Design a binder for these strands. Sequence first.
DNA 1: CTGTATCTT
DNA 2: AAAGATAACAG
Length: 223
Amino acid sequence: MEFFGESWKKHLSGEFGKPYFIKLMGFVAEERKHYTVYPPPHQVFTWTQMCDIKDVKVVILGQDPYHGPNQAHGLCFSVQRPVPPPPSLENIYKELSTDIEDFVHPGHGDLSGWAKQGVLLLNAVLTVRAHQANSHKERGWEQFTDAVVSWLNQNSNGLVFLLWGSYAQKKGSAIDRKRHHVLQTAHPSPLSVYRGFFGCRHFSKTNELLQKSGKKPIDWKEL
DNA sequence: CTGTATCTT
DNA sequence: AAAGATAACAG
Ligand SMILES: O=c1cc[nH]c(=O)[nH]1
């Protein structure tokens, strides 16, 4: 039992031996010696421990992990108790509130509830240097998350991809737009939320798309 | 008033 | 590549 959930490791292990991955892990290792890197090592792959890869139905793709102390824990936009929801998450909650009638602020920021239902909470970049947004971009993470997106794209069907922000949107070309649904909008951070995230209705839209594909909708309130 | 993207150069 | 300009609002 460890970092990678079994089904994910089984389908993503081929990346482990590739030079970019070995180099990526080396960079992250080196960074952790000189700076605080988020999330902690045992939580970088939390997104593989919530459900079987074949049970993924929705993929929310963010930019990179929260860069503040105690925030990031491996699920994009999620913070474990007792850490209060960061600005981005408060905005996600505000959107859910107007988008989903029954949605009410859960009193915490832990999104494991969605992840357990098949919502992959992935970030384009999986580690970040403390206090430096997107500091670990272009070091190899993108190729790894490309592998995750590619596998899902090729082996699943009717997945709903939620690409939040410019960086997450780089994965768009990797998805078969007829085989899957790709919804794109601005990143929920206060610095960009006003550019489309508010009013995007991605949560209700995701459920509509799921229902049309004959899949059970995500209970966004189940947190 | 300080901290939490996106576009342009 | 990296940083300036722009931007919106909570604590
Ligand atoms: O996990 C997170 C948190 C904030 N912003 C992101 O892109 N991802």
